[PDB]
């Protein structure tokens, strides 16, 4: 088959400036008619793939012509000029040369805004989960940037391990930053057996960590 | 304009077989090649194979040439994919598209799984810079997805639906937050609609202020 591929997992770039982006084809995607069978899709979460650019530099009907393509018949390239915070997504190249089609591993397109800490929010159980035996304790960070954000639960100042869990939102398509919840689940006994339930967490934006707490029937 | 409706989401028992369904409208169906494609959980595009409707004639990745077989029936404008042998690897969502890649279907989530169905609980997050942060905790659900709206969708602005987390149960669990004015807590009602469609489960869950 022919291999493509893109040596970049993800591209920074400051909305305004241009970004390119790299693929590779491990033959020549030219034909005998002249074109170059190499196609630049955009996939934004949840969405079905777009393409932006056919036959390796011609612009897809309705795409903003500061998507551009360009390449040899091997190495490609996508240019993106004046980029928009909402230009965030995954883009992939692909050939259609020849059978079976194959894609890129995609090239992320991360969007450079100011340095933000997060804003932390730290939610006891309700008493209707704990009506059922069982505790989890949220804590929010929100609209941050970068990405980068760790987490350490703290009982009674006692590290916790092993009974947390993390989920990060999309980079935001209007703001660019990100939101991230970690959650301690414990048995409802144990809620009841320690007072202090504590977040803390460790950010670029922060010169040092940032503890949320909240004491137990309180 | 041109549309490629594909079929519903599909929970199915490993070792059978599914078999979904990209109906084409505004165009002739006969003149124009659909492909196929697989996505799995946050990884990247494959190409399945493709079928000349008008001919019947197909062409299948290599990787694919033993689990799926492409048809299509010109009377209702109709591609199809059927995927033998499934196992945990088939769970994925499969895109079609016509030839070239310009309209695509929307995509057909496929679970395979021999877990049962089970639908979520919903536990408030109770709100406690003059901003206040609440929620809804969504838990102990199968399979994915579970959507979340606030106030039925009147309220937008701020809200982040995490991505669901695999717990060391076996079940789902999310959450959904909104950030609003505190001046508001006392004044407006907060509601998020939780719907889990493969468990017909709908909770509405006001979340009071403590």
């Known amino acids: 088959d022919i291999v493509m591929t893109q040596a970049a997992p993800s591209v920074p770039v400051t909305p305004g400036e241009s970004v390119s982006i790299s693929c590779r084809s491990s033959?020549?995607?030219?034909?005998?008619?002249?074109?170059?069978?190499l196609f630049w899709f955009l996939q934004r979460p949840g969405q079905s793939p777009q393409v932006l650019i056919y036959?390796?530099?011609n612009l897809a009907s309705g795409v903003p012509d500061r998507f551009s393509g360009s390449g040899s018949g091997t190495a490609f390239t996508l240019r993106i000029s004046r980029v928009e915070a909402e230009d965030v997504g995954v883009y992939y190249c692909?050939?259609?040369?020849?059978?079976?089609?194959?894609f890129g591993s995609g090239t992320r397109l991360e969007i450079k805004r100011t340095v933000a800490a997060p804003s932390v929010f730290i939610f006891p159980p309700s008493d209707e989960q704990l009506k059922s035996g069982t505790a989890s304790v949220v804590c929010l960070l929100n609209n941050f940037y970068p990405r980068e954000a760790k987490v350490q639960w703290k009982v009674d100042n006692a590290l916790q391990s092993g009974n947390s869990q993390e989920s990060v939102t999309e980079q935001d398509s209007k703001d660019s930053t990100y939101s991230l919840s970690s959650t301690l689940t414990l048995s409802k006994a144990d809620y009841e057996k320690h007072k202090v339930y504590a977040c803390e967490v460790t950010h670029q934006g922060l010169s040092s960590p940032v503890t949320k707490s909240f004491n137990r029937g309180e | 304009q041109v549309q490629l409706q594909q079929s519903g989401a599909e929970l199915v028992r490993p070792g059978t077989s599914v078999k979904v369904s990209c109906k084409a409208s505004?165009?002739?169906?006969?003149?124009?090649?659909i492909e196929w494609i697989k996505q799995r959980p946050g990884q990247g595009l494959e190409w399945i194979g493709v079928?000349?409707?008008?001919?019947?004639?197909?062409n299948y990745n290599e990787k694919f040439r033993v689990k799926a077989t492409l048809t299509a029936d010109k009377s209702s404008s109709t591609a199809y994919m059927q995927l033998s042998s499934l196992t945990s690897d088939d769970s994925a969502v499969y895109f079609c598209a016509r030839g070239g890649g310009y309209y695509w279907g929307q995509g057909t989530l496929v679970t395979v799984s021999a877990a049962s169905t089970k639908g979520p609980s919903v536990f408030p997050l109770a709100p406690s810079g003059g901003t206040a942060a609440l929620g809804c905790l969504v838990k102990d659900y199968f399979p994915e997805p579970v959507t979340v709206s606030w106030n039925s969708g009147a309220l937008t602005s701020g809200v982040h639906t995490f991505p669901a987390v695999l717990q060391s149960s076996g079940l789902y669990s999310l959450s959904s937050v909104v950030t609003v004015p505190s001046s508001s807590l006392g004044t407006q009602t907060y509601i998020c609609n939780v719907n889990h469609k493969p468990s017909n489960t709908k909770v509405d869950k006001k979340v009071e202020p403590k």
């Open positions: 033959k020549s995607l030219l034909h005998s008619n002249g074109n170059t069978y």
């Open positions: 692909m050939q259609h040369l020849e059978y079976p089609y194959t």
């Open positions: 505004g165009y002739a169906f006969t003149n124009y090649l």
């Open positions: 036959r390796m530099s």
């Open positions: 079928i000349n409707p008008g001919s019947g004639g197909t």
